[PDB]
RNA sequence: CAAGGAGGUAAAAAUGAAUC
RNA sequence: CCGAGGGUAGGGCCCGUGACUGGGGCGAAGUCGUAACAAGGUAGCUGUACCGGAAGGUGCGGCUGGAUCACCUCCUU
RNA sequence: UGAAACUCAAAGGAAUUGACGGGGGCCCGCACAAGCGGUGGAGCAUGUGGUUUAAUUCGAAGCAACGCGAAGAACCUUAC
RNA sequence: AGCGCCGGCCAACUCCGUGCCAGCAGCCGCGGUAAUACGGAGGGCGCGAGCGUUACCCGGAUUCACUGGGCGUAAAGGGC
């Protein structure tokens, strides 16, 4: 499946910080903050300047290592985002946050986008009536992404939402924190987000 | 080349030539070694390079590369031809898969065991 | 096949095993491959021209080399130190 | 405020009496992503020395770079000797689409997107040369209509 | 004059050499002395009889023995290890 | 004052050593 | 009558094979000589012809992909 | 008219810096020539190659190694 | 949870073994004592229910050039 592992290691191999785990990467053992240099025994070694190549590997890795997922869907999503009409990165953007998983994790029912999936999985989130246990379900404008009926409870979910009771959510979506729901508005625009990847190098280094 | 040129003499097209013509368009063949020895390379290497010449279905008798270190060959070993030239071997085209009929793959190896046909080893994990 | 040591020769041997055992090693490889092919093998043999003509070089190391002649049933070895 | 960035880094070498004389080139290119680009070559028998006199002949020589909201405004063909290469306008949203040389020389002048491709011989030196000769000879509608207008 | 090895005398010398250090050393001894003296040195010199005439025989230890033949340009080294 | 248009030229002295 | 095929004789094209034989290529350096590259020690190359262990030599003609860079002979101070 | 098997990892064009010429022009150095005194011949000293020898410890190898490392080997030195 | 790779193209580096051997290899090429290029280890990179290899087709190949090549000396003006 997917990748399943050290995650530390990637956020360090990329040497910039890009929330994988929740609570650990807001506390000050971010494992950047003790050791901001890449992985390995050279870690510490001189920084050799990187090829055109390196530049686009690293891009498209961060990219991919943000949302938690395989080349395969990665690449399939790619081609279908160039192939559409419209500029291909913002619609490259806005297909990749158009996962089910990914706008569980933007509402706040788990502080980590594995977490999300976990829960998407063992059917913890409800999608207009519905319950949804794919992680790839591509949302669309005006989908209630709840949680289920048993799966209300549940100590875990609580937490999560009484943590993000006070946290505003992005324009692109709604939230009913009480209610346990949430809403998916529209897509998100290019300037709504603001990932730490320069999309252009990841659209020119698939364009071999 | 003026238009009328082109229409009456047009252009000729590329009709690559096959470096592999023992296999027949088969991706692999079988083949029967005949004779089992070590040949000295080419021009700027020393070493004995072992091949071994290989008469296979289609009816051609070849010589083959023997990858890795060692090997089990004899002169009625029934082995398997997978192509690819070794650039230091004249007349040596063609290369000998291990982990088949009877070659067998290389021992003790522990990184590269897909190519040369190597079982994965269980330090019991 | 019968291995004849000249005076140089065997004095060369003789004072690497006080020496260097490596060479040793080498040298008694390229024997030992120089009696099964005289001509093809170890230490990429070639003919020797005017100077020490009839003899064949076989590289020991970078800057040693083992001269030697082949006869139907003997082996002479002119040399195993120094460059020829 | 000038984005300075080498591409080519060779060792060239004289002959003498006694052997080689080495002699180091750099090919540097210096631009601000905001439509001024330049390109220099400079040569010295030490790589900083190269990079640093490669880099002050690179600031003498600059071209202005019409871009218009994302790229280039029309197509052109530059051939530099035996070296020709063909720069392409591209819609918002496709990448900068060119080798090592145009890459780095279209990148620094501001091109987001871009299509190009080296015909011919494809030395480093005169794609360089073809590139800038080729964004040299970029016109817009106000400079056509400015030359077709009579006055 | 020059040395001449046997296939099964070479064996015999190289399997001293990757076994005992000792007895390489001996042979070493015995053979130089050869060289000087045919006829006379270390090894009590005692010649073979009856299809071994013409051989000579010098004992390394209480149990091998170097035989050998001498002529004018060359020596022949038949055995320097007694095979059981 | 300068040079062109033309014209007859050494020899008997050969080879290269085997870490590209 | 025609007719599948069978038989007889004579051809045409292609493939395998053959004592022996001709050159080609590889095996970093076997023997013989010095042809070409410096006027390469007789400028070189070439078509042809003859000859010679061999590169090649010579005859006839041709070419610049060579040579007027100094005395000393034919015509000018 | 006009291929193929096989083989090679290149074959090439122009131009640049060098090196070379039994190419040229200009010009130096006991380089030649002019003129002395020598070595190679003899005896001996010293060093080296070779061979001998238990060991003859090692290095230096055209010019630019060879009375050179020794501006000092009877045992010391000294490494055989 | 497995597979390929970690000289350059090509993302990814150290130690030990080895010593023009054993071996790698698609090209340039690596190995005749410290081998980031062989074998192993640690570590890293790329993919992941797969990862590599072989065969074939297209691409790169504007090296059959309609788009889109050339013929003084590089292959190429036919002797007229
Ligand atoms: S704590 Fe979060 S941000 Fe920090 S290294 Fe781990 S995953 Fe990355
Ligand atoms: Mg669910
Ligand atoms: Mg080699
Ligand atoms: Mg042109
Ligand atoms: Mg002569
Ligand atoms: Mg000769
Ligand atoms: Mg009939
Ligand atoms: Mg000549
Ligand atoms: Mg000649
Ligand atoms: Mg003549
Ligand atoms: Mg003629
Ligand atoms: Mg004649
Ligand atoms: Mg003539
Ligand atoms: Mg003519
Ligand atoms: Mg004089
Ligand atoms: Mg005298
Ligand atoms: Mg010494
Ligand atoms: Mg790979
Ligand atoms: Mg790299
Ligand atoms: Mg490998
Ligand atoms: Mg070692
Ligand atoms: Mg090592
Ligand atoms: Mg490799
Ligand atoms: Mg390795
Ligand atoms: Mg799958
Ligand atoms: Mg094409
Ligand atoms: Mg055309
Ligand atoms: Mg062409
Ligand atoms: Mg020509
Ligand atoms: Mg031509
Ligand atoms: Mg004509
Ligand atoms: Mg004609």
């Given at each position: 499946?997917?990748?399943?592992?050290?995650?530390?290691?990637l956020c360090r191999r990329e040497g910039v910080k890009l929330y994988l785990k929740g609570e650990r990467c807001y506390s000050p053992k971010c494992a950047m903050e003790r050791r901001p240099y890449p992985p390995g025994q050279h870690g510490q070694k001189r920084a050799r300047r990187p090829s055109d190549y390196a530049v686009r590997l690293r891009e498209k890795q961060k990219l991919r290592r943000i949302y938690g997922i395989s080349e395969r869907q990665f690449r399939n999503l790619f081609e279908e985002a160039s192939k559409k009409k419209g500029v291909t990165g913002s619609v490259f953007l806005g297909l990749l946050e158009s996962r089910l998983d990914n706008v569980?994790?933007?509402?706040?029912?788990?502080?980590?986008?594995?977490?999300?999936?976990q829960l998407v999985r063992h059917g913890h989130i409800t999608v207009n009536g519905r319950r949804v246990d794919l992680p790839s379900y591509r949302v669309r404008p005006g989908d209630e992404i709840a949680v289920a009926e048993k799966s209300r409870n549940l100590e875990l979910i609580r937490q999560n939402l009484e943590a993000m009771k006070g946290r505003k959510v992005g324009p692109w979506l709604s939230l009913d924190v009480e209610g346990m729901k949430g809403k998916f508005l529209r897509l998100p625009d290019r300037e709504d987000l603001a990932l730490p990847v320069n999309e252009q190098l990841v659209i020119e280094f698939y364009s071999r | 080349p003026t238009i009328n040129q082109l229409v009456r003499k047009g252009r000729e097209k590329v009709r690559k030539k096959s470096k592999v013509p023992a296999?027949?368009?088969?991706?692999?063949?079988?083949?029967?070694?005949?004779?089992?020895?070590?040949?000295?390379?080419?021009?700027?290497?020393?070493?004995?390079?072992?091949?071994?010449?290989?008469?296979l279905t289609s009816g051609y008798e070849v010589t083959a590369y023997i990858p890795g270190e060692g090997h089990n060959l004899q002169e009625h070993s029934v082995v398997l031809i997978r192509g690819g030239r070794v650039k230091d071997l004249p007349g040596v085209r063609y290369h000998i898969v291990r982990g088949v009929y009877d070659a067998a793959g290389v021992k003790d190896r522990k990184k590269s065991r897909s190519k040369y046909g190597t079982k994965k080893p269980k330090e019991a994990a | 096949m019968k291995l004849i040591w000249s005076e140089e020769s065997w004095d060369?041997?003789?004072?690497?095993?006080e020496t260097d055992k490596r060479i040793v090693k080498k040298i008694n490889e390229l024997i030992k491959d120089t009696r099964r092919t005289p001509f093809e093998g170890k230490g990429k043999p070639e003919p020797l021209k005017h100077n020490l003509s009839g003899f064949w070089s076989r590289r020991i190391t970078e800057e040693h080399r083992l001269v030697?002649?082949?006869?139907?049933?003997?082996?002479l070895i002119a040399a195993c130190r120094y460059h020829y | 405020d000038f984005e300075e960035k080498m591409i080519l880094?060779?060792?060239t070498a004289r002959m003498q009496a006694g052997g080689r004389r080495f002699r180091f080139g750099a090919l540097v290119v210096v631009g601000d992503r905001q439509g001024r680009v330049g390109l220099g070559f400079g040569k010295a028998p030490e790589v900083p020395l190269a990079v640093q006199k490669a880099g002050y002949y690179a600031r003498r020589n600059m071209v202005e770079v019409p871009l218009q909201n994302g790229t280039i405004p029309h197509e052109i063909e530059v051939e530099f000797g035996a070296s020709k290469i063909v720069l392409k306008p591209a819609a918002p949203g496709t990448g900068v689409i060119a080798g090592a040389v145009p890459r780095a020389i279209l990148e620094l002048a501001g091109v987001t997107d871009i299509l190009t491709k080296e015909l011919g011989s494809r030395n480093p030196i005169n794609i360089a040369y073809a590139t800038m000769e080729a964004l040299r000879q970029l016109r817009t509608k106000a400079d056509v209509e400015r030359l077709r207008k009579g006055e």
């Open positions: 499946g997917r990748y399943i592992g050290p995650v530390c290691r569980v994790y933007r509402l706040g029912f788990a502080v980590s986008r594995r977490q999300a999936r | 296999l027949k368009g088969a991706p692999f063949r079988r083949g029967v070694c005949t004779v089992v020895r070590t040949v000295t390379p080419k021009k700027p290497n020393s070493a004995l390079r072992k091949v071994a010449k290989v008469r | 060369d041997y003789l004072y690497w095993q030697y002649a082949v006869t139907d049933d003997s082996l | 880094i060779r060792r």
